[PDB]
Tab-separated table of C-alpha atoms and ligand atoms in Angstrom:
chain	number	residue	atom	x	y	z
H	988	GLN	CA	72.789	95.910	116.941
H	989	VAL	CA	73.641	99.412	116.520
H	990	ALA	CA	74.922	100.152	120.053
H	991	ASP	CA	76.446	96.444	120.164
H	992	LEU	CA	78.210	97.701	116.896
H	993	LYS	CA	79.487	100.882	118.015
H	994	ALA	CA	80.688	99.461	121.163
H	995	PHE	CA	82.417	96.559	119.187
H	996	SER	CA	84.167	99.075	117.130
H	997	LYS	CA	85.136	100.807	120.421
H	998	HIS	CA	86.969	97.677	121.906
H	999	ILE	CA	88.403	97.053	118.765
H	1000	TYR	CA	89.950	100.529	118.449
H	1001	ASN	CA	91.218	100.312	121.953
H	1002	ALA	CA	92.830	97.032	121.307
H	1003	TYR	CA	94.569	98.536	118.258
H	1004	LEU	CA	95.659	101.745	120.423
H	1005	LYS	CA	97.033	99.505	123.044
H	1006	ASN	CA	99.033	97.025	120.892
H	1007	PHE	CA	100.517	98.904	117.926
H	1008	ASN	CA	103.647	100.952	118.533
H	1009	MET	CA	102.723	103.230	115.842
H	1010	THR	CA	99.439	104.707	114.753
H	1011	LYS	CA	98.806	106.719	111.511
H	1012	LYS	CA	97.939	109.903	113.549
H	1013	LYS	CA	101.370	109.659	114.913
H	1014	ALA	CA	103.053	109.193	111.498
H	1015	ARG	CA	100.821	111.716	109.848
H	1016	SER	CA	101.771	114.498	112.252
H	1017	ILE	CA	105.776	113.379	111.784
H	1018	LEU	CA	105.243	113.364	108.171
H	1019	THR	CA	103.488	116.666	107.825
H	1020	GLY	CA	105.760	118.467	110.438
H	1021	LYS	CA	103.644	118.921	113.687
H	1022	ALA	CA	105.843	116.342	115.260
H	1023	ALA	CA	112.749	115.465	112.923
H	1024	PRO	CA	112.945	111.843	111.452
H	1025	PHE	CA	116.757	110.906	110.830
H	1026	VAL	CA	117.037	110.266	107.094
H	1027	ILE	CA	118.190	106.935	105.965
H	1028	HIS	CA	119.115	106.987	102.296
H	1029	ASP	CA	122.647	105.063	101.991
H	1030	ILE	CA	125.166	102.683	103.565
H	1031	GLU	CA	126.339	105.186	106.226
H	1032	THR	CA	122.738	106.675	107.347
H	1033	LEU	CA	121.728	102.887	107.744
H	1034	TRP	CA	124.744	102.362	110.119
H	1035	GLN	CA	124.157	105.725	111.830
H	1036	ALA	CA	120.404	105.068	112.330
H	1037	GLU	CA	121.262	101.314	113.631
H	1038	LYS	CA	123.873	102.811	116.238
H	1039	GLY	CA	120.593	103.935	118.316
H	1040	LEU	CA	119.271	106.879	116.544
H	1041	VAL	CA	116.653	104.687	115.184
H	1042	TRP	CA	117.257	101.063	116.470
H	1043	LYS	CA	119.223	99.879	119.788
H	1044	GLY	CA	122.680	91.611	115.775
H	1045	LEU	CA	121.488	90.772	112.173
H	1046	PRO	CA	122.701	87.705	110.405
H	1047	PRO	CA	125.878	88.622	108.810
H	1048	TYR	CA	125.256	90.084	105.070
H	1049	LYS	CA	127.594	90.991	102.492
H	1050	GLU	CA	125.967	93.772	100.833
H	1051	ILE	CA	123.660	96.566	101.461
H	1052	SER	CA	120.591	94.847	99.634
H	1053	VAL	CA	120.661	91.929	101.950
H	1054	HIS	CA	121.156	94.293	104.938
H	1055	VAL	CA	117.942	95.965	104.040
H	1056	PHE	CA	116.401	92.627	103.291
H	1057	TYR	CA	116.891	91.768	106.786
H	1058	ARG	CA	115.984	95.008	108.371
H	1059	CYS	CA	112.427	94.294	106.555
H	1060	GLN	CA	112.119	90.899	108.087
H	1061	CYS	CA	112.946	92.694	111.656
H	1062	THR	CA	110.017	94.829	111.069
H	1063	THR	CA	107.683	92.081	109.879
H	1064	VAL	CA	108.646	89.860	112.568
H	1065	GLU	CA	107.910	92.925	115.398
H	1066	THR	CA	104.621	93.608	113.188
H	1067	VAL	CA	103.634	89.812	113.578
H	1068	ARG	CA	104.096	89.914	117.293
H	1069	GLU	CA	101.745	93.318	117.957
H	1070	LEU	CA	99.216	91.669	115.328
H	1071	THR	CA	99.002	88.701	117.381
H	1072	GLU	CA	98.447	90.802	120.724
H	1073	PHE	CA	95.791	92.810	118.743
H	1074	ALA	CA	93.852	89.686	117.551
H	1075	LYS	CA	94.301	87.953	121.096
H	1076	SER	CA	91.671	90.974	121.974
H	1077	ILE	CA	89.039	90.981	119.138
H	1078	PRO	CA	85.739	89.649	120.540
H	1079	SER	CA	86.044	85.751	120.353
H	1080	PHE	CA	89.008	85.472	118.655
H	1081	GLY	CA	90.697	84.223	121.751
H	1082	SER	CA	87.690	81.625	122.029
H	1083	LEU	CA	88.680	79.676	118.462
H	1084	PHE	CA	90.542	76.682	118.491
H	1085	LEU	CA	94.172	77.945	119.194
H	1086	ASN	CA	95.055	76.205	115.882
H	1087	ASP	CA	92.641	78.344	114.210
H	1088	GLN	CA	94.134	81.429	115.782
H	1089	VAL	CA	97.561	80.321	114.428
H	1090	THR	CA	96.328	79.720	110.969
H	1091	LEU	CA	94.397	82.982	110.692
H	1092	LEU	CA	97.470	84.734	111.925
H	1093	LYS	CA	99.721	82.563	109.526
H	1094	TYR	CA	97.736	83.563	106.657
H	1095	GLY	CA	96.543	87.120	107.213
H	1096	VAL	CA	99.562	89.012	108.959
H	1097	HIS	CA	101.332	89.974	105.486
H	1098	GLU	CA	98.074	91.374	104.226
H	1099	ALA	CA	97.492	93.418	107.520
H	1100	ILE	CA	100.987	94.439	107.604
H	1101	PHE	CA	101.017	95.794	104.260
H	1102	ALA	CA	97.832	97.986	104.975
H	1103	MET	CA	99.431	99.267	108.031
H	1104	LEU	CA	102.946	99.957	106.415
H	1105	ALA	CA	100.962	102.438	104.277
H	1106	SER	CA	100.006	104.601	107.139
H	1107	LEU	CA	103.880	105.532	107.125
H	1108	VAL	CA	104.139	106.155	103.459
H	1109	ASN	CA	104.473	109.317	101.548
H	1110	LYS	CA	105.598	109.188	97.507
H	1111	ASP	CA	109.117	109.800	98.673
H	1112	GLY	CA	109.406	107.175	101.561
H	1113	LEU	CA	108.323	105.891	104.769
H	1114	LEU	CA	108.808	106.338	108.569
H	1115	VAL	CA	110.326	103.474	110.055
H	1116	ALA	CA	110.883	102.159	113.951
H	1117	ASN	CA	108.452	104.293	115.638
H	1118	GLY	CA	108.884	107.545	113.590
H	1119	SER	CA	112.591	107.736	114.237
H	1120	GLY	CA	113.597	107.134	110.931
H	1121	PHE	CA	112.635	108.124	107.259
H	1122	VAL	CA	113.865	105.722	104.314
H	1123	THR	CA	113.659	107.146	100.869
H	1124	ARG	CA	111.747	105.276	98.326
H	1125	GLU	CA	114.748	106.530	96.075
H	1126	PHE	CA	117.568	104.664	98.190
H	1127	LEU	CA	114.985	101.704	98.198
H	1128	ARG	CA	114.578	101.826	94.268
H	1129	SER	CA	118.574	101.702	94.254
H	1130	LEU	CA	119.123	98.283	95.723
H	1131	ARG	CA	119.750	95.587	93.321
H	1132	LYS	CA	116.841	93.516	91.791
H	1133	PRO	CA	115.437	91.301	93.447
H	1134	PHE	CA	115.096	93.430	96.379
H	1135	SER	CA	114.076	96.363	95.223
H	1136	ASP	CA	111.204	94.817	93.015
H	1137	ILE	CA	109.894	93.452	96.126
H	1138	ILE	CA	109.901	96.839	98.012
H	1139	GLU	CA	108.188	99.167	95.167
H	1140	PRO	CA	104.972	97.168	94.883
H	1141	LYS	CA	104.199	98.410	98.541
H	1142	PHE	CA	104.642	102.142	97.940
H	1143	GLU	CA	102.246	101.553	94.806
H	1144	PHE	CA	99.696	100.049	97.244
H	1145	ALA	CA	100.578	102.716	99.766
H	1146	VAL	CA	99.946	105.691	98.009
H	1147	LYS	CA	96.520	104.821	96.409
H	1148	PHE	CA	95.343	103.302	99.852
H	1149	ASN	CA	96.227	106.823	101.555
H	1150	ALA	CA	94.060	108.640	98.915
H	1151	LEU	CA	91.059	106.991	100.716
H	1152	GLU	CA	92.019	108.859	103.977
H	1153	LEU	CA	91.110	106.251	106.476
H	1154	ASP	CA	91.970	106.778	110.263
H	1155	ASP	CA	93.229	104.719	113.020
H	1156	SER	CA	89.614	103.952	114.027
H	1157	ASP	CA	88.872	102.675	110.612
H	1158	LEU	CA	92.139	100.656	110.375
H	1159	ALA	CA	91.310	98.911	113.461
H	1160	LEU	CA	88.341	97.480	112.207
H	1161	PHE	CA	89.867	96.886	108.511
H	1162	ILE	CA	92.844	94.774	110.164
H	1163	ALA	CA	90.491	93.027	112.422
H	1164	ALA	CA	88.476	92.035	108.950
H	1165	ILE	CA	91.638	90.812	107.318
H	1166	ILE	CA	92.510	88.479	110.029
H	1167	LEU	CA	89.089	86.898	110.812
H	1168	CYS	CA	88.820	85.453	107.089
H	1169	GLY	CA	87.074	82.013	106.668
H	1170	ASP	CA	88.739	80.769	103.882
H	1171	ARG	CA	92.362	80.438	104.780
H	1172	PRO	CA	93.758	77.106	104.326
H	1173	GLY	CA	93.477	74.514	106.925
H	1174	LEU	CA	90.851	76.188	109.363
H	1175	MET	CA	88.692	73.957	111.381
H	1176	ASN	CA	85.674	75.949	112.090
H	1177	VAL	CA	84.941	78.252	109.132
H	1178	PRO	CA	81.309	78.982	109.928
H	1179	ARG	CA	82.495	80.582	113.380
H	1180	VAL	CA	85.259	82.568	111.900
H	1181	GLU	CA	82.744	83.664	108.822
H	1182	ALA	CA	80.813	84.584	111.554
H	1183	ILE	CA	82.891	86.690	113.583
H	1184	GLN	CA	84.093	88.103	110.549
H	1185	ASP	CA	80.445	89.182	109.374
H	1186	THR	CA	80.017	91.339	112.853
H	1187	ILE	CA	83.535	92.920	111.929
H	1188	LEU	CA	82.194	94.136	108.388
H	1189	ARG	CA	79.020	95.322	110.001
H	1190	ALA	CA	80.771	97.045	112.419
H	1191	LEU	CA	83.197	98.793	109.718
H	1192	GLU	CA	80.052	99.287	107.443
H	1193	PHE	CA	78.269	101.289	110.263
H	1194	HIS	CA	81.565	102.951	111.177
H	1195	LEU	CA	82.464	104.136	108.156
H	1196	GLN	CA	78.604	105.664	107.377
H	1197	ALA	CA	79.093	107.533	110.657
H	1198	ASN	CA	82.783	108.624	110.126
H	1199	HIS	CA	82.932	109.338	106.910
H	1200	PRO	CA	79.628	110.523	105.909
H	1201	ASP	CA	80.452	111.967	102.440
H	1202	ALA	CA	82.188	108.850	101.245
H	1203	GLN	CA	79.272	107.046	99.675
H	1204	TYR	CA	81.019	104.286	98.378
H	1205	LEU	CA	84.009	103.616	100.719
H	1206	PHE	CA	82.805	100.406	102.250
H	1207	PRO	CA	82.921	98.424	98.663
H	1208	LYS	CA	85.866	100.305	98.116
H	1209	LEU	CA	87.605	98.895	100.969
H	1210	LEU	CA	86.492	95.208	100.743
H	1211	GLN	CA	88.303	95.686	97.326
H	1212	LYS	CA	91.447	96.779	98.863
H	1213	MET	CA	91.170	93.635	101.112
H	1214	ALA	CA	91.240	91.949	97.501
H	1215	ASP	CA	94.187	94.052	96.334
H	1216	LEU	CA	96.048	92.967	99.475
H	1217	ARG	CA	95.438	89.248	98.907
H	1218	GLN	CA	96.731	89.873	95.365
H	1219	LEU	CA	99.852	91.722	96.756
H	1220	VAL	CA	100.698	89.080	99.000
H	1221	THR	CA	100.410	86.193	96.471
H	1222	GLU	CA	102.818	88.595	94.424
H	1223	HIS	CA	104.743	88.827	97.563
H	1224	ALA	CA	105.086	85.339	98.356
H	1225	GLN	CA	106.093	84.383	94.715
H	1226	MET	CA	109.119	87.005	95.251
H	1227	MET	CA	110.458	85.502	98.431
H	1228	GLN	CA	110.298	82.247	96.746
H	1229	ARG	CA	112.553	83.602	94.135
H	1230	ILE	CA	114.686	85.212	96.602
H	1231	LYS	CA	114.907	81.788	98.438
H	1232	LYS	CA	115.832	80.030	95.207
H	1233	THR	CA	118.256	82.345	93.801
H	1234	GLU	CA	120.036	84.157	96.520
H	1235	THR	CA	121.276	81.316	98.600
H	1236	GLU	CA	123.339	83.083	100.756
H	1237	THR	CA	120.432	85.135	102.356
H	1238	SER	CA	118.553	83.669	105.346
H	1239	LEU	CA	114.916	83.946	106.767
H	1240	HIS	CA	113.916	84.778	110.339
H	1241	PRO	CA	112.641	81.445	111.763
H	1242	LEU	CA	109.102	82.866	112.645
H	1243	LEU	CA	108.922	83.845	109.018
H	1244	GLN	CA	110.115	80.662	108.251
H	1245	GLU	CA	107.146	78.673	110.020
H	1246	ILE	CA	104.976	81.617	108.481
H	1247	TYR	CA	106.061	80.460	105.160
H	1248	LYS	CA	106.167	76.690	105.979
H	1249	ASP	CA	104.977	74.883	102.951
L	2759	D32	C1	105.619	100.339	102.034
L	2759	D32	C2	106.635	99.864	102.037
L	2759	D32	C3	107.921	99.330	101.648
L	2759	D32	O1	107.895	98.127	101.773
L	2759	D32	C4	108.265	97.615	102.916
L	2759	D32	C5	108.715	98.579	104.157
L	2759	D32	C6	109.088	98.416	105.340
L	2759	D32	C7	109.683	99.238	106.444
L	2759	D32	O2	110.513	98.968	107.199
L	2759	D32	C8	112.201	99.215	106.660
L	2759	D32	C9	113.147	99.376	107.512
L	2759	D32	C10	114.252	99.629	107.351
L	2759	D32	C11	114.761	99.617	106.328
L	2759	D32	C12	116.018	100.082	106.038
L	2759	D32	F1	116.475	101.266	106.667
L	2759	D32	F2	116.798	99.297	106.060
L	2759	D32	F3	116.169	100.602	104.338
L	2759	D32	C13	113.766	99.368	104.990
L	2759	D32	C14	112.593	99.112	105.324
L	2759	D32	C15	109.423	96.930	105.638
L	2759	D32	C16	108.803	96.093	104.534
L	2759	D32	C17	108.219	96.264	103.249
L	2759	D32	S1	107.884	95.205	102.189
L	2759	D32	C18	108.558	93.603	102.822
L	2759	D32	C19	107.850	92.887	103.916
L	2759	D32	C20	108.241	91.727	104.346
L	2759	D32	C21	109.400	91.182	103.834
L	2759	D32	O3	109.961	89.894	104.198
L	2759	D32	C22	109.715	89.306	105.486
L	2759	D32	C23	108.390	88.609	105.223
L	2759	D32	O4	107.885	88.583	104.084
L	2759	D32	O5	107.878	88.083	105.937
L	2759	D32	C24	110.404	92.050	102.969
L	2759	D32	C25	111.505	91.477	102.428
L	2759	D32	C26	109.898	93.084	102.458
L	2759	D32	C27	110.418	93.538	101.401
L	2760	B7G	C1	102.093	84.085	116.350
L	2760	B7G	C2	101.455	83.647	115.139
L	2760	B7G	C3	102.543	83.480	114.021
L	2760	B7G	C4	101.956	82.474	113.273
L	2760	B7G	C5	103.267	82.017	112.400
L	2760	B7G	C6	103.079	80.358	112.705
L	2760	B7G	C7	102.583	79.625	111.622
L	2760	B7G	O1	103.303	78.178	111.440
L	2760	B7G	C8	102.677	77.012	111.712
L	2760	B7G	O2	102.671	76.795	113.235
L	2760	B7G	C9	101.959	75.616	113.298
L	2760	B7G	C10	102.569	75.487	115.093
L	2760	B7G	O3	101.321	75.877	115.422
L	2760	B7G	C11	102.830	74.248	112.833
L	2760	B7G	O4	102.069	73.206	113.065
L	2760	B7G	C12	103.010	74.746	111.258
L	2760	B7G	O5	103.577	73.602	110.538
L	2760	B7G	C13	103.581	76.062	110.878
L	2760	B7G	O6	103.268	76.262	109.342
């Protein structure tokens, strides 16, 4: 087992470095000022940032709240695309039935995504694009409800998550575990997913005992954060449904539309 585990963790860590445009290692040095980000904090900085300083269009919007809402959708779509390629490299994810892969992604990407935004976060805002911009929490608290309500819970999750001091090597296995979940609805081969998931959790448990020797309780602490993410994402989807019911001008990217189908 043990040399298997260490090498299974290595391959997952490699898949992660290979597939994600941003790492917490790069985020954390930018945010501390070892590695500059353009500060987005109102209409005119968003315009500046989108005119090439941060991004290189969007469905028409009529106000800054919808506009940011659509910027959030762009990111999520970009993160879903990279999460898919990451997963296509986790051991034997690739060998599940193609529909179970899709089901596992349909139902786990927003949990993974919310774990990973956290890497980009400090109490005051978060890095965006690939570290080229910094959006202030005050600007986002300023948007009108329901938009600002759907954003703030992610900063609350993020800061507490960051208090645990995970690094990219840890997050690669955490994210793998969130995606290989035997209880998503509609899965066909539960036992096999459940089985890959158990190898992943044994790999993480091992990895955390090596990589974080003094944190004696980190492992069940991280199991609980996955449960916090499930609830965080329950809440999120209830707010997206509220926005769909009440803000009828606004639209949803087609991929998000499938993900949300039902
Ligand atoms: C942590 C934290 C704060 O929460 C977020 C932060 C981001 C980072 O991306 C942004 C990029 C640009 C902008 C800007 F500049 F337009 F303000 C804001 C945020 C992106 C998304 C979220 S939360 C989120 C995630 C997904 C999502 O909708 C798409 C979906 O649910 O599938 C929406 C509407 C939201 C609000
Ligand atoms: C890249 C993976 C992203 C996953 C998001 C796509 C999930 O949507 C589902 O895709 C299926 C097509 O296979 C349809 O049969 C379902 O009705 C639909 O809900």
